[PDB]
Amino acid sequence: EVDSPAVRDSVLEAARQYNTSVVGFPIASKNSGPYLDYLQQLNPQRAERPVIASISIPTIDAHLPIYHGTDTATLEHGLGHLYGSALPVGGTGTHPVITGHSGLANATLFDNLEDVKEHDPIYITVQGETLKYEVDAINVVLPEDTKLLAPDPNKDQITLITCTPYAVNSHRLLVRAHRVDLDPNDPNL
Template sequence: MSTSVQTPARDEEQASLLRRVLLPTIFILLGVIGLMYPIVATQWNNSQQAKVAEQYESDVAGADPHTLNEQVEKARLYNDEKAGGPILDPWLSRISEDNTEYQEYLAQLSGLRAMSQVAIPSIDSRLPVYHGTRENTLQHGLGHLYGTSLPVGGPGSHAVITGHTGLTNATLWDNLSKVVVGDAVYVSTFGEQMKYEVDKIDVVLPEDVDSLRAVPGEDRLTLITCTPYGVNTHRLLVHAHRVPMDPADTGALTDSGTIFQWWMLILLIPALLGAWRLIWWINKERRENSNA
């Protein structure tokens, strides 16, 4: 019976191999994970937001039409009563949520997973809309700007919907800057489906809210996000007016969804190259070690 004895030279050779293989492998894997995380996180959150939008429409389809209509009419009455109130920038100003007026606001269009949903086919976007513009709200979808009309349409109404740009883990309204005059925007609120046509695009300072006020006799919608991308010193305002909705337009509220972003390709290519290089290098080291 014989036993193999590890010589100091053999131990050093194995330790050297471990240093050559293990440490570089760890660093490369960390790099690949770092490159892949924003892509995976963004696509995951995008899918969750799309699921909420789909479930919202399912909830509406399964709800009592009379109850839905009551909610919409109640929201329109609320709009009439609250018209002319103060409008504040959604990112600079915060409203105390424990006051009676804000609680009354939260009671409007309640009972479903979201207040509404907004679809913009030209940028393949369909997102749920929630009450208010708290940071936690805007991390998960769009927010309705408190102080503006609830998104149920009607003469003299002007709903303002806000959304983030530049998050590392969600697309949201990264592509809102690609919207052009003439594009369609669809809003679905408790069974009320509305179509708006973009007629003006502005870039303003956060304090400039004059264009967000309601215009007597007009049915308007404005979409807001921060700009420039990653700097966020100004606000991009996409203004639209109500137009008739054709039966063929109803598909826009179910077909739109988030898309693969161009920046994901920039991260995905080096991540895949890094993974391929790691596999090639490990196989090379294994062959050299077996031949030694």
């Protein structure tokens, strides 16, 4: 059964193993061996567009699916995981980058990522498990300025990225967060 603890445990372990192979950060033929392996991760049901994880950001009332990659069509319907960053299964040394659109008239998506503040919680649910992160940095940068996406071998971090669609020139909003302990009774779960 896809939802069994045995399967979920194996899929999580497989994704942690995949993550050991991620050595840079994003600064790809979908037929390459590594991209094909990426697409098999977090997808024991072997579906074509699986939801790999979901994210909750209660301070902006956002609850959204995350998919593999950053195809145009994907980002009209949810969040994209940036290939070349770790999959969002936690671990010291990992730095998943999760992207979403702002401004699309029919879908809120990351429209309000700009209203997230320092210390706000972010919850990632993946293969039945929930990981809690807390916001520690908020930066608006030029789209080529990607230094802040680097992994740090002693931290378990994530960055959520969106565009600044009201600005005349293109920029990116980067909201960085670090792993924290999860209270089992946390209201938000």
